């Protein structure tokens, strides 16, 4: 039979050590470095770190919000379903409104995507939330427009990591320029649900 | 306010056209090419195609199995939750046994990961199934060992795309060498749930 390593806790340790031995992580603060390592781990890609950008203090602020019980608002089910419940510090609610039955008609009325329209349903949980956008550039652009209104509830942090060829790089560059609340992005086309989930999981628990 | 493209159907078309204009896709058959384009789209990474390998006839065989009602067996919830139900041709069941309450003790008894142990519960649905492994190298290695027993039910196809630094590249290279059933892999460290889901979604429906 095929022989292979079967100890999961050991595989995690070995993966993180391989990443730290290869990656270019010097510019990151200790709180940022742990997040970047987990993102590289999720992507299977040393080199991803050259694209990661944080607002100063974001990693400290997002961990404090999660420890205070902040909900995590997710643009897609792959993100909400990926968050490790066992790593959550304060029984944090993990929400995704994409599949709400009111979303298809609301998107039609708004002239926007279902991913963006679903963010309107985040309003009651948005104040102090940790936002996790790993898919949809239109959700990130729409959130920036929602936050231009002073009446809109404001999240504690935004993990803005949508992936893609159309609008993704622009949505993340616009988030960093707008600086609405503390943020982290993967500049360019890279991103996605796995990288976004890894950022949430890294910030949720102090143990790698 | 920020201006951006809001037509989702249009964004998909533009994304696929950008990928076809940049990517090195000549070696793929027409059935394989559509799968590779969707995988690049999910990853946000032209260049991913240099790592993709298919067994001859896999893309045709996997689409035929899905059209015949084959279940899709997934190593992780990010994979099962990512599959687009609307693209499924024959009310295909999408299964993930990772969270079954019997898995933690079975993994302890087997001396293996929860991801690998959960595959034992796939046995009743495995004959003719489409396997979608996007996370766990130990699930892919364990499946290869299960299939060395002639009594084991055999899937119609394996999408073997686990990501990672430890065991991932080896598990996928071992799947291609063993050639148990038709397969597709992303050679090396790259892979993951998004790429795996994109392969399933591409094979499920004839419309991109
Ligand atoms: C094409 C655009 C859009 N994708 C639709 C969305 C549907 C909608 O919201 O109306 C629309 C049409 C619009 C989203 C938007 O552009 O903001 C949505 C979000 N994608 C989903 C799955 C997939 N998307 C991926 C990447 C991208 N997709 C899009 C991109 C935009 C840029 C581009 O095309 O290059 C990028 C981001 C690349 C892969 C996942 C990536 C990951 O997890 O890492 C995967 C798996 C690829 C695949 O389709 O096979 C469903 C997520 C459902 C959920 O989680 O609840 C979805 C709601 C469609 C559906 O099934 O109904
Ligand atoms: C470290 C190893 C393992 N990961 C555990 C698994 C737990 C277990 O099965 O016992 C164990 C410990 C073992 C799996 C194995 O190696 O086969 C499992 C599968 N990972 C999960 C999430 C994550 N994994 C990722 C990648 C990898 N992880 C591992 C790798 C192995 C190689 C390496 O480390 O480089 C790679 C594959 C890189 C990212 C997702 C990647 C994606 O979707 O694209 C993300 C999000 C990273 C993160 O942890 O933040 C849960 C999936 C749960 C589910 O879907 O139901 C999990 C069951 C743990 C949990 O939360 O209980």
DSSP string, B85-125: GGG-SS---EE--TT-TTHHHHHHHHTS-HHHHHGGGGHHH
Q: Beta-carbon neighbour count of residue A20 at 10 Å?
A: 13
Q: How far apart are the first and last CA of chain B?
A: 32
Residue from A195, A197, A194 nearest A186 by CA? A195
Cβ contact (<8 Å) for A138 and B44? no
Alpha-carbon distance of A205 to A119, in angstroms, equals 26
Cβ-nearest to B1 among A2, A42, A145: A145
Q: Which residue of B has its CA nearest to A165?
A: B15
Atom of ligand 2 at shortest distance to CA of B76?
Answer: 55
In this structure, which ligand is nearest to the CA of A86?
Answer: 2
Q: How far is the CA of B144 from the centre of ligand 2 (A)?
A: 19
Query: Residue B5, SS3?
Result: coil
Residue A41 known to be catalytic: yes
Q: Do residues B108 and B128 touch, judged by C-beta distance below 8 A? A: no
B67 within 8 A of B90, measured Cβ to Cβ: yes
Q: Suggest the residue from B1, B2, B14, B176 to mutate for an interface test with chain A (most A CBs closer than 10 A).
A: B2
Closest CB from A1, A77, A191 relative to B145: A1
CA distance A128 to chain B (A): 23
**Residue A47, CB half-sphere, CA atoms under 13 Å: how many?**
7
Ligand 1 center–CA A177 separation, angstroms: 24
Nearest residue in B to A78, CA atom: B78
* Cβ–Cβ below 8 Å for B166 and A15: yes
Q: Return the half-sphere exposure (C-beta side, CA atoms, 13 A cut-off) of residue B178.
A: 24
Q: Long-range contacts of range B24-28, CB-CB < 8 Å, 24 or more positions apart?
A: B24/B49, B24/B50, B25/B49, B28/B52, B28/B54
Residue in this structure with the two tokens 């979604």, named with its chain if needed: B201
- Chain B residue with the nearest C-alpha to that of A142: B2
Q: Which CATH code, of 3.40.50.10230, 3.40.50.10420, 1.20.120.1630, 3.40.109.10, is assigned to A1-208?
A: 3.40.50.10230
* Strand residues in A20-74 grouped as ranges (E): 52-54, 72-74
As a whole number of angstroms, the distance between CA B4 and CA A167 comes to 7
Q: What is the DSSP string of A105-130?
A: HHHHHHTS-HHHHHGGGGHHHHTTPE
Contacts of A78 in chain B (CB under 8 A): 78, 81-82, 193-194, 197
CA atoms of B38 and A118, how far apart (whole Å):
24
Phi, psi of A84 (to 5 degrees): -85, 110
Kindly list the residues from chain A whose CB atom is less than 8 angstroms away from the CB atom of residue B2.
141, 144-145, 174
Are B37 and B58 contacting, i.e. CB atoms less than 8 angstroms apart?
no
Separation in Å, CA B146 to CA B119, B128, B153: 9, 15, 9
Q: Are A61 and A180 in contact (CB under 8 A)?
A: no
């Amino acid at each position: 039979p095929h022989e292979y390593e079967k100890d999961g806790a050991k595989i995690y340790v070995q993966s993180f050590a391989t990443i730290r031995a290869e990656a270019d992580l010097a510019r990151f603060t200790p709180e940022e470095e742990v997040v970047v390592v987990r993102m590289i781990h999720a992507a299977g890609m040393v080199g991803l770190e050259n694209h990661v950008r944080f607002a100063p203090g974001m990693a400290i602020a997002a961990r404090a919000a999660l420890e205070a019980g902040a909900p995590i608002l997710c643009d897609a089910r792959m993100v909400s379903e990926g968050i490790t419940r066992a790593r959550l510090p304060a029984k944090n609610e993990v929400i995704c409104t994409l599949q709400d039955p009111r979303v298809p008609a609301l998107a039609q009325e708004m002239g926007n995507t279902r991913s963006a329209a679903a963010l309107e349903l985040w309003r009651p949980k948005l104040e102090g939330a940790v936002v996790a956008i790993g898919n949809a550039p239109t959700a990130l652009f729409h959130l920036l427009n929602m936050l231009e209104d002073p009446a809109c509830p404001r999240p504690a942090a935004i993990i803005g990591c949508p992936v893609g060829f159309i609008g993704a790089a622009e949505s993340k560059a616009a988030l960093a320029v707008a600086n609405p609340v503390p943020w982290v992005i993967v500049e360019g086309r890279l991103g996605g649900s796995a990288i976004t989930v890894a950022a949430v999981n890294a910030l949720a628990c102090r143990k790698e």
